[PDB]
Paper text:
PII proteins are key sensors for the metabolic nitrogen status. Af-GlnK3 shares the canonical fold of PII proteins, consisting of a four-stranded, antiparallel beta sheet and two connecting alpha helices. It forms a tightly packed trimer with approximate dimensions of 30×54 Å. GlnK proteins, when activated, are sequestered to the cytoplasmic membrane where they bind directly to their corresponding Amt proteins, physically blocking ammonium uptake by inserting the T-loops deeply into the transporters' substrate channels.
MgATP and MgADP bound to the protein in a highly conserved nucleotide-binding pocket, a cleft located at the interface of two monomers where the ligands are in direct contact with the B-, C- and the T-loop. As under good nutritional conditions the ATP/ADP ratio in the cell is presumed to be high, the ATP-bound state of Af-GlnK3 should represent the common physiological situation, signaling a state of sufficient metabolic energy. Even in crystallization trials with high concentrations of magnesium salts, no Mg2+ ions could be unambiguously identified in the binding pocket. Structural variations in the conformation of the three phosphate moieties of the ATP ligand were observed within the asymmetric unit, and the T-loops were still disordered. The bulky γ-phosphate moiety cannot be accommodated without breaking both the salt bridge between Glu 38 and Lys 101 and the hydrogen bond between Glu 39 and Lys 58. In consequence, the base of the T-loop loses its fixation points and the entire region becomes disordered. Whether this state of the protein is competent to associate with the Amt protein remains to be elucidated.
Numbering used by the authors:
A (entry chain A): 1 to 39, 53 to 110
B (entry chain C): 1 to 38, 53 to 113
C (entry chain B): 1 to 38, 54 to 112
The structure:
């Protein structure tokens, strides 16, 4: 399992949500953040976290890249982090790699 | 070490906080988030606790029991590896086994 | 690649920002959080994704600029990052082998 962490322009949230939903990726956690790159320096950004299985990573990344890009500086970054265990609170069932 | 990341109902924060504290897990970082899985995005609470490998199951069980309602939307817990843990005050760094 | 996650006192943000910028680490994501250690108080989360060899330099920069010597100075967590993608170009940064 992997956690796909994307930091995008706030106005692109709806595009990213739809591009994900269309491909069958309905689960997500969204956080309001601030940041800067090689560009008051800290500007408003949006963080989208999606936990998926290993094989779905490239599809999720391609969905975010296509829906979040503008071609201008400040489009954002996607970070892929390993997830060793995923637990459903309701049932107590644990998904392990 | 591992980072236990739990996304819970905002009203369950006090239960989770109290449950973790009882078991000796006092250190935690809390973030106000939004999410979906099944208005669109709904208000949720993210609780992050960095613990040693052997304490993971106990931390997960503490969160599961205190955050549960039996209804859909109870939340998820994600376990992430932590390679280095640094205490700012002393500069002391905690590193995982082997090498 | 690694993600350096620092949880600091909110008043130390400008120090940390400057200390990282001086060393060439301009890219960062900041989140307003709450927490406790050894009663949930306002804290600042700073995330910086860097290459493996730059980790120690980044950690030392944060430690020196964020410390006060008093309890509540915070923690730095180092998390592995398998892939880093630039949304604008679609270019992927991975560790060779
Ligand atoms: N190394 C990094 N670590 C953590 N967050 C980062 C990093 N680099 C960028 N970010 C985050 O992604 C957001 C967008 O950064 P972005 O790199 O796209 O800006 P940039 O200066 O215009 O460069 P470019 O589009 O050419 O890569 C930042 O505001 C910040 O929140
Ligand atoms: N795959 C995922 N990646 C990231 N965050 C997720 C994912 N799945 C769920 N979440 C987060 O967890 C919260 C709860 O998700 P969900 O709607 O599936 O309810 P649940 O309690 O996890 O599961 P269930 O519907 O089976 O009871 C969401 O609002 C979202 O913040
Ligand atoms: N184990 C942990 N897991 C997650 N976040 C933590 C953890 N420990 C501390 N934090 C975060 O770092 C912040 C600062 O904690 P800190 O450790 O500096 O306080 P303290 O424990 O009272 O003092 P000290 O570490 O010097 O004994 C907390 O408010 C919380 O947001």
């Amino acid at each position: 399992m992997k956690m796909v962490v994307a930091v995008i322009r706030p106005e692109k949230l709806e595009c990213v949500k739809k591009a994900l939903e269309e491909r069958g990726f309905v689960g997500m956690t969204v956080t309001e953040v601030k940041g800067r790159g090689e560009q008051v320096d800290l500007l408003q950004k949006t963080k989208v976290e999606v936990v998926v299985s290993d094989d779905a990573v490239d599809e999720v990344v391609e969905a975010i890249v296509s829906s979040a890009r503008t071609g201008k500086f400040g489009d954002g970054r996607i970070f892929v982090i390993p997830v060793e265990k995923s637990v459903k609170i309701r049932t107590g069932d644990e998904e392990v790699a």
